[model samples]
Target: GRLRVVVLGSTGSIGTQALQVIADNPDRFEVVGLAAGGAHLDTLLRQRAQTGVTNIAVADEHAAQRVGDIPYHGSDAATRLVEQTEADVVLNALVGALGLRPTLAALKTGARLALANKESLVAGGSLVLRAARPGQIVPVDSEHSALAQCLRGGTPDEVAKLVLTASGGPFRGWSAADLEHVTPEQAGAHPTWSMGPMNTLNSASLVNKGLEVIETHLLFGIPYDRIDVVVHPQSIIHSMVTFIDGSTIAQASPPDMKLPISLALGWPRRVSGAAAACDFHTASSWEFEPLDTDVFPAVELARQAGVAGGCMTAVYNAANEEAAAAFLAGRIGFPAIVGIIADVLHAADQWAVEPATVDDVLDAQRWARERAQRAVSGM
Candidate 1:
């Protein structure tokens, strides 16, 4: 049989791109299962027919009814899909905190995880790492994937630190006072990448970069102090790995999710070029700038949570998700999103318990959501 593949979040940006990559390598891969949210049932079903996928999971109850006897149903169905399907790889691109359970399930089953879900690491970093087999959970995020690619050429001891590049989002140079009147539309209009609203909003807040910093720390054994963030306007250089000997290794690619998706699917080897190739011959000057934490406080706040450890990262992620949702709904201003997260972080002493299990992580997330909701209400 071809290398069995299961794709979660079948209808999202990453999911669609992953399927395209898998389809391109039909001789090398066979998609056995597909799972996604209910809103995109038609697209999911269309993909199922195209791939001849036997196992399917619908995370929405109403959508499950429309799916007509899928192997899995409800919000926990992705976890069930991972546990039951004996696939070679599980590409988890599910949105929000929902991706955690399936991440653990895939790792425990000894299947390689093409992890597009950063929340899995953000909320359950310790548990997920403990469950991960050596080099098992490969990241699909562009920056982390670039770092992993760079690290392949050197020993861990030779590494000095990792550098993550940010596109600086849609509001890179906005002053604090200017951001106070920012709308959800303005925040979601990302200049470099096409992503979901939450991720786009996060890019504007620079919270996405912060979450990635924690992800790098957990995945690579890099200390929080050793990781650095910079803004690159062109986004041609995905990320860089600085060596202790003062040389830097970098991964340069056009801003495309499919490149990393293909990398994760074909580990220890370079596979098909499914995405647009970078045009380095063009005379475009690449620009790099430092992060301004004053206007975009999410980076510092995320770093604080990451360094604090325990349940703080979970709280930070949960609170940010909550606040971002409210901002997208126009319930709060764009500036208020990080403010809500900061407020929750201040009260984190009450809920920052040790995350010994998935439940502990979920508890922190729950507590943070409630606290963030209250903070949002007060605004």
Candidate 2:
């Protein structure tokens, strides 16, 4: 039986790639709804037409009118789609500090969530983990998908640790002394993954790696100390899972993100040829080395935040977003991104017995945004 699907944040990089993946697998999926962050209506309408997905969503009403057939749900449409749409699968691809609500909606409705939005799990790990009674959230990030594949059908206790791989971005080997002088543009040029400028800068600061540390703990139930990020220059091996016996399992393929995307979509059932096939014949030698924590302080700050849980991770994420925005805006230096996150994670005093509602998340985000802003303003 074919599964019905809805994509939140359908106009961004991950969203567009997801649509392409779904379109390629027309027989396997039906696009029931599309949600965007109040922009990109022309592309959204084209998608609605091609997929005959009549229901549409956006943050703005004027923007929704651009998509003619899209029944405007406005801003909160992803929530409605998760609860009402017959879609058995939901791809929550919304980026940044705005992913928690859709993630909750999809999970509350018991739909299998194929998640690309890191903020959901990275910021609200415990929140979503509590919702996964049996099977709920599915990770679409290449690192997480790799670890998930390695842990397939095995008891979690059998696992020792997860080793997340990073390409080291453009500043992989640079010392802290060297990174201080890098411009935002130089640091943002990730050697392997062609990401947006913000994400590219994150890759350089190893903030992406930091987010994965938070994400890996939630996805695999691995502890902060147990999960490690290594500088994998080749980027061929997405991730590695080690067992208690010292044996390691690794998922390797050509650096095609579509593989992880397809795995998230067709979980419990493997698909054949859904992505570019891997070639080990000419595969250059793979190299692994210790991550330079001194150069990437963001990783440890995030690990500490992950251990604290609750609003701490949210503060970590929000501070990073705001700090990065400031750095990109020339109000702060590229190196200060991690500095702001570290300050907030330690300085923040928020706590809760439960993950707050959407309002709580937003409030915490705003709080951290102001804190990070003040930190930048001081400089």
Highest lDDT: give the candidate number: 1
Q: Residue-wise lDDT of candidate 1 within 1-379, one digit each (tens)? A: 3678899998888888888888889877878889988888888788878878869999899888965768899979989988999899999999877898999999988999999998899898788888897899899989989999999768999999899999998888778888888987787644444367676777789888989998988988988888898999899899999998899998988787788888888875667566788676877777899988888878788778987888899999889889999888878888888888998999898555567888898888898999999998884
Worst 10 residues of 2 by lDDT: 188-197
Give the per-residue lDDT digits (tens) of candidate 2, residues 1-379: 6787888888887777878888888788777888887667777777777877777777677776654555655666667766777778899888765677788888887789999988787667677777765657788888989898888635788888888999998887888788778876676543444245677777888888988888888776778999888899989889998888888899988787778888788786766776766666763689998878877888888888878878777888889888988887778877888988888767776643346465676677788889998899994
Off by over 4 Å in 2: 67-69, 189-195
TM-score of each: 0.94, 0.93
lDDT of 2: 0.79
Q: By how many angstroms RMSD does model 2 differ from the true structure? A: 2.4
**What is the alpha-carbon lDDT for the whole of candidate 1?**
0.86
Q: What is the C-alpha lDDT of each candidate?
A: 0.86, 0.79
